[PDB]
Design a protein around this ligand. Structure first.
Ligand SMILES: CC(C)n1c(NC[C@H](O)COc2ccc(CC#N)cc2)nc2ccc(Cl)cc21
Ligand SMILES: CC(C)n1c(NC[C@H](O)COc2ccc(CC#N)cc2)nc2ccc(Cl)cc21
Lengths: 203, 203
């Protein structure tokens, strides 16, 4: 009845904040997970009949969807503590373009400017687990959401490279792509107001 | 000796923070202002011999320049308090694409995805003063930096539309594009460390 896409980069804390708020107003609610790389490809399918996508991916205008900002999350670029680039010097960070990147693939094969790989040496996976497996074994480096990485960092098994590029981790906006229909529906503006307010309570 | 570009979107508070820090290490320092729309076009000119650009504009890789994040600033979309879109409803914000936008022009005529206009009805100017003139007279709407707008907002002469798109104003990263040469130069890493640290003191 109300279909909702949540990409894999959205912390599960955000996913309970949304579900909780939506259930106040809506009777039937469906929650679908996607790779960030497949999130916008999915809502562009009319048959998929998504009503709301919460995703990190951005495009300037999709046909029947408006865009707004729900909040902010932090990606880090990570590699094996004894990776070529372990020192994390600006030179190291410049060289990311030359060392093998572990990137999320996409059904369509295409990628947004925001999400495509920065490296020529690229090896695709389907999710951030497949990614962080290949990375603890040093096959490459990858960008992954904070919540996927916090453990393996204090567990010494992974190291951050991003800090000299963007201290505190790479800020990424969480977009809300909503069917135009839902503008001027108190139920949705209520979802938006609450979801946001409760993620300023998180942040 | 050290040429530094600062685009017009960089608050003048950031511009004193940078200059102060740079003077500790460097003897001869030149500060050049540019439209955000002309900032990257300028450093791509080899003859221009820029060593550092501080700008809101982003491209994935310029030839002899690396990129990093200095901090964050806030744009707002603004119009005449009695503009068609005064209510600032999601429908209003969706309609930005149809009402006349006052945008900054560029020498090259071309624009980055990040900075190009969202509207078909578009009227170019050269700076945010020319912009906010045309906007208080309701010829259109425009996105302008916080520091350009704070006065005319509490002076009732301008109204915000952005809030339902991005509460608190549209977060935009401030990029630092530095000549590859300056990586592994304590003087630059000192500038970076201090400039950043003193803009977390601002923020
Ligand atoms: C939104 C973005 C941050 N992102 C990506 N991938 C986009 C791109 O391939 C990332 O490449 C970069 C590599 C290095 C640097 C600078 C440094 N250090 C910048 C970009 N994958 C993501 C997964 C999760 C999240 Cl939250 C954001 C991701
Ligand atoms: C970096 C960006 C925010 N920006 C721009 N122009 C880019 C683009 O033309 C802005 O259009 C938008 C219009 C509406 C919305 C959603 C709402 N409400 C989003 C984008 N010009 C800028 C001037 C100063 C600064 Cl700091 C950022 C600017």
């Amino acid at each position: 009845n109300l279909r909702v896409l949540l990409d894999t980069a959205i912390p599960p804390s955000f996913c309970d904040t949304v579900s909780s708020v939506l259930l106040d107003d809506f009777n039937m609610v469906s929650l679908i997970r996607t790779s960030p790389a497949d999130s916008l490809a999915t809502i562009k399918q009319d048959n998929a009949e998504i009503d709301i996508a919460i995703t990190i991916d951005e495009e300037l205008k999709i046909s029947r969807f408006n865009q707004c900002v729900l909040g902010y999350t932090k990606a880090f670029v990570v590699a094996h503590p004894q990776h070529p680039l372990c020192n994390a010097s600006l030179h190291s960070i410049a060289s990311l373009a030359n060392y093998r990147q572990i990137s999320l693939g996409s059904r369509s094969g295409q990628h947004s400017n925001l999400l495509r790989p920065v490296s020529d040496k690229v090896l695709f996976v389907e999710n951030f687990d497949d990614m962080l497996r290949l990375v603890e074994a040093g096959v490459g480096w990858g960008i992954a959401p904070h919540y996927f990485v916090e453990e393996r960092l204090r567990n010494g098994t992974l190291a951050v490279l991003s800090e000299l590029y963007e201290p505190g981790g790479i800020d990424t906006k969480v977009y809300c792509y909503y069917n135009t229909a839902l503008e001027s529906e108190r139920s949705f503006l209520r979802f938006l107001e609450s979801a946001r307010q409760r993620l300023r309570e998180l942040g």
